[model samples]
Target: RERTVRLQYGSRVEAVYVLGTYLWTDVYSAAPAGAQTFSLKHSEHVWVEVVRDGEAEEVATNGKQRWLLSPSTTLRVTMSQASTEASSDKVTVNYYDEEGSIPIDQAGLFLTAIEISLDVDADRDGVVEKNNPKKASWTWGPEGQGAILLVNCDVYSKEDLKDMSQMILRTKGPDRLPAGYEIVLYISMSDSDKVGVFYVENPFFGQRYIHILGRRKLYHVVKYTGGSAELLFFVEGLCFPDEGFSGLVSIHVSLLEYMAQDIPLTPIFTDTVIFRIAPWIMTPNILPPVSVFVCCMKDNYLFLKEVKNLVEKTNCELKVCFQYLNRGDRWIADEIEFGYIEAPHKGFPVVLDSPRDGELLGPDFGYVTRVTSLDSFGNLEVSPPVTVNGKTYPLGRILIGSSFPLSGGRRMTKVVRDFLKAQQVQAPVELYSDWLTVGHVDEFMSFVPIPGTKKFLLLMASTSACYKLFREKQKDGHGEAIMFKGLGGMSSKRITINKILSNESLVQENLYFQRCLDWNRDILKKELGLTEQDIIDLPALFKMDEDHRARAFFPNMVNMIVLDKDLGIPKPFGPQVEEECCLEMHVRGLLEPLGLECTFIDDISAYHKFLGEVHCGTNVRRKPFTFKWWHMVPSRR
Candidate 1:
């Protein structure tokens, strides 16, 4: 139905719609203004485009509608009143592409349609007047034409919302729901797990009634806690105990409705789960996502499964690596996938990807032994690193020759800067000595405060220097007398020259124990071969000490040395005897200032006879380096 009053009267109109499933032309007379506006039923992905007369301004072309029409307004159309229709106004209808693309089957491809309609003389006008109605048919093709897909059509009548207010749903209790009712809901790919306890405060006869509805799905819930209801919570992974008949997997809220009405409930959503059957493998009791990489031999199927479980359980991705063992020549895993895993020496299957762009990490600079310049061996033995993370650090040879300053070649600078940039280096880049950062240096020194590890004085010593010095001194005069005629050996003459020679052979065995103190303290005393700082810093990194002590090396003191060295100390009466006292006192003087206690090592074998002393006796673990990357990058370099 189409009808139009004067523009003055038309301005007063407000709402309009269509009824009966008819087009606007069937009900009202129309007028020309450009495109006409009409009411229609529902539409999917509805949109509209309005065209005006002349160089018209744009109008909204997208909206949905109901199926009714009122007489408040009239729409314009392309057709006019001829003879049969009473004349009032005329209008033009451009193709209706707004409702749907026009002309269903525009070419061979089918196009959706747009629907337009009108209805009643709703104003109770004297004659049956036509106007846009409140409701009309849904349109589907081009020119608003196509077959109506009933399934997609969301059809509703005025009574649909109005009459459905009394709808109700019902469900059963855990009695019918099972006593001590326990349910497990599993949410795939979540690290959060929750348990629910529904205690029946008023159970008749204490019938043990409880119910729970988890936020996640069913399978994930059943894990970890299972049906025992002895409630436990896990941050990641689905874990639950086994049970008989394991209850049911259905929507609780929906189930509640169905039980009330004695009908079955349908699920809004559903999915299946595959429970991981293997335990997580790692270094002892530690959890996944550990800080260090793990190297072992195995297919990572176990690792990947555990990781999936970890992500699902804790909702976090752990940083770790599994050395996947394959048959024949080994293959290294992808760096992007597993962080860092290596089969070193055999080379890698893939060029391990560096940390992603912007992930360039600075080298964890620790205390490396200072070389005035690296000898060919030190230089050749330790390959200089060029980049940290992916960024390049300053690179150059650590000059070990005539000067105190290390060679700072452009390459070395680049390598260093790249590393610093990677670790977000923040301090002044000093050489081996921490304080060297404050000034120039000329000798082998202790690292005062290593930029990485945040510790001062990482003690390092080559077995070649102090160990050799102690050996030479012992062979000539100092060491031989300290051992040969000591109180422990003087009275055992019946032991023969063979036994004395045996004692002499074992003298240097315990040297490493004494050397630890000698070397480290030398660094403190600035007595290290190369001249460096006198006092290194507090926290320091160090390789294992080279000194050693073994009981098997001494036969004379075997039982006696392990049992009674102290009481016999004052009874020594030979050249070796007196020298031992003198040496002990001298060693004490060296140790006293370093805050260490010292005494005579009457026989090197006593350390082992005593069942391990300093080096082998104590099991020491070194902490790994934590990097500091603050200043120094994006700065000069």
Candidate 2:
């Protein structure tokens, strides 16, 4: 409804004004000048639309006008015709019928990740203990306790760091320290780079942050698996601050009513046992001069096929031997000419022989890692004698088994269930006790190549010794204890006569088996011999069968077998394996399997203390993987 004002004298229109919503201006002559409608369009928005005589005009008009003009009222006058005909009359115009919103970028705002952890005030004091910060932060319940701990990069001070460490330890304890949990101490020269665990005995339960230098002494939390046990203090990368700091601070202990009954030396970690598989090829590929050989027993039918699938899945070329149960109730490993099915026995052998029915997935292809004797629930784990090459290594102290949830459903011990559920990520802790085993050098070398893997990761699973799953089972309550001796013989004492194998002999045995397979393949080729033309025209006689089963890899923890091929000496298992053509693993070195990298310890042991071997000690299957943040707790790095 904006209009233009006209200044006319009789029939001569002198000028016109541009205003109202918007109006066009033009100089007139004696003959009345013709007028046309015009509009102004805005650039930044569509909120304003000014029309002059119902048409878009090019005249300038400011956006301050709040209402549209009526057609009959020519409210605007051009600069030449208006009373205030100065340079100030010049203006801009905008025409926007529809309103539009513009979106602005939020990139300028600050954004970063922050992890917060707090503990309940355990002592209920307004002033917290300076040195005993960890104990002060646990959350409390009628029966349960809670604590809090947080690591802020900005918070720096000797007293602050000490209080933070103590707070974490007291709340979660050093043993329960999560992955990537660590501390920093800005110390000067001449102090001798002081780093390591502080051992504060039985502090007042209600004490707040206690001081480290004030009477309370510090103790070292060494690698209880196989390191210097007597060292008072030890830490890695303590010299430089930018290297920053991360590692195990200590361990925490929650004394629950049921958990308190557990013997300190051999306590049940939790009830859940999950086995994980390593999801990559395990065997090494060697060129002609040195061929790699790997083998395993395929007793259970489902387990046998699973083993076959496992090998095939790994993309690692290795052969396995599946010996059938003999007619005389004995296990005889002979050349299996044909794929024999199993019968119905209490064990897997009969089930495998019976109708090809049962769970398609079973543990038949289980690779033997270690078999050890069991001790009483209250007994301490015995350390094995360490031997390197031709020399003997000294026995190291003990550190008991440590385990956490992997896709957990139930709790084994109330402590673990409650601890995991209540604790935040990267919690800290301290350890006063230990779980130990014979430190083997070969086992240590096995994890050296773990860092190179890109596609796979490792998980460590552990369990207690009270379960028969780790120990020998008996037929009757009074029957002699039956160890996992070769096929379970009649006499318990005679079960130790089975032959031991060296790595070389084990490979040689596989080579012999492959030769037989080549002969069979050749025979089949000969039986269906044909000319080149005929071969091209012939149809395929065999169809490929599909393996439609899913398998899990990367178990949390795995036990290892130490191979020694010596045939002649009567030992546990008959003549030792002959040391011929065996691919040698550096007994002092490690075999870094693809994909397992952080939060681990390779304990060289024949068995897991006397309770079981590393393989037997760990049990859990198909658990999800996790990543570690950089607070850097060393226990689970």
Candidate 3:
């Protein structure tokens, strides 16, 4: 309510206060007695060294007031002080006028006072630092500064269960605040639904948590009592990164003043603090497994039993989503992607429930979901920690298979892609994957851990490599050994190594599949800093349809579940030579040398016939990476 205050009384010796630390100048005009005017246009914030209790000290003031330099101008100075004495500072007036018939310029001011600031863990050292200049920006690495916030996505979960970041409101001499001055914390209208601000009003009075900012209530006028008072608040982020909201959100605090009781208050002082809400980060296969989750389907009893044995041997706990809870859905890996959200003080597992809306989004563990995406999370995969050029991704980069970029070829939803990119720590790498019928990267590629400087091996399916292996076996007098022998029902059963090598159409279709795989291979090599030596080409073949999309001829060896040192591979029904499948023997030979144990699981009847295998039917929740996400330096995106 800043109505114009008129000063008609002369010899009043009025005062006006300003706020700033800069060099400025002002002009005062000599006019007739009835129309005199003065303008402090070039103001140094109208700051005056006011003496309190006979001591000379400088203090803050509400110094952002402006004046309407007009005739009969008023210098209405608002002051708060003792009745014992009053003081004044001399003004140095400057003048420049046109001689006889010229005029002079004049401007005047009346200002108010309010002191305020908002604080957070700007350094991200598990402590809320005060008034950091770098509060608006966020960075990474050991030298990184700025705050980190966890997405409070504990669905159907309470405050004591989810991780919420701390915040503070600090004020100086609150009692000296001018009349009608109030403090408020506000957020943008867009992000009003994404963040929740809460604080405890009084501990003695039942310690109730009051909601500060909300839907229509974009700003909350917090209580600012007298003295050096600090009010603590907790900020709980409501959503993970998505299309409309990038991870970054800002909270603003301001001091408002009212010149007239009937008018709205004017904002004078303000501060802003920015935060990056932690995304649901996925763990790659290389990380040690914490739990192996599977479903009990009526048809896949045999498959579940073998997976149970594999989990029992891996030393991690086994979890069954069960027929009662899962209803009938058995694609465990596709339903939800198990990952974790973390901050400096705490890290916890969170399942990124697929937009498919499977029944597995409940109980025992924390969960989050972008309910808008169109597909399952099986299309998403992440690499083990990789270093490109000289920059290292300690948490690894995210990988997504796309039909095409910026197109309508049935790609992962744009919102999901934006969500991944918004995570910031893992720079997402998109690979063209429309060649396959399922169009998932897991159909042909996976990564497994190893020791030494190479760190891990990129396992990819190669049809060309399969032909080469068959050729070597054909030359060694094992060409007569038949494949698919034990299977009672199938279309292309019992084919020898010699027949598969000589078939022209079968070979041509596989060659096309090989070329498609090679395209993704080159992308991985360039994006992940991987070379041929860092990759393992597992022998596999694919059949092409009339639409030019490919499907695995046998179970894809690359689509396997890795649990620590154990790998549950799909049993490839290739040519059995001397009581062993040459495909299994070759894969085992290639991997066992690197201290890995391969357990081939037969899924032809139950899973492979439906174009899915062991990996697609099971999920794994891995242990968190030892490298903290905040410690990973990001590249120029």
How high is each candidate's TM-score?
0.23, 0.18, 0.78
lDDT of 2 by residue, 213-256 (tens): 21133321212111111211111112111112221122222211
What's each prediction's clash count? 124, 130, 9
lDDT of 3 by residue, 38-137 (tens): 2232223344332223343342343322233343332323234211112222232222233421224333333332335588998877888777778878
Q: Give residue 541's lDDT in candidate 1 (0 to 100).
A: 13
Q: Distance (Å) between predicted and true CA of 375, model 1?
A: 34
After superposition, the stretches of candidate 3 with alpha carbons farther than 4 Å from their true spots are 1-115, 155-162, 172-178, 201-204, 296-301, 322-330, 355-358, 361-364, 371-374, 404-409, 452-454, 605-616, 632-637
Candidate number with the higher lDDT (1 or 3): 3
Candidate 2 regions with alpha-carbon error over 4 angstroms: 1-411, 424-451, 455-557, 560-575, 580-637
Ranking by TM-score: 3, 1, 2
Question: After superposition on all CA atoms, how large is the RMSD of candidate 3?
Answer: 7.6
- Model 2, residue 515: displacement in angstroms? 32
In model 1, the Cα lDDT at residue 590 comes to 33
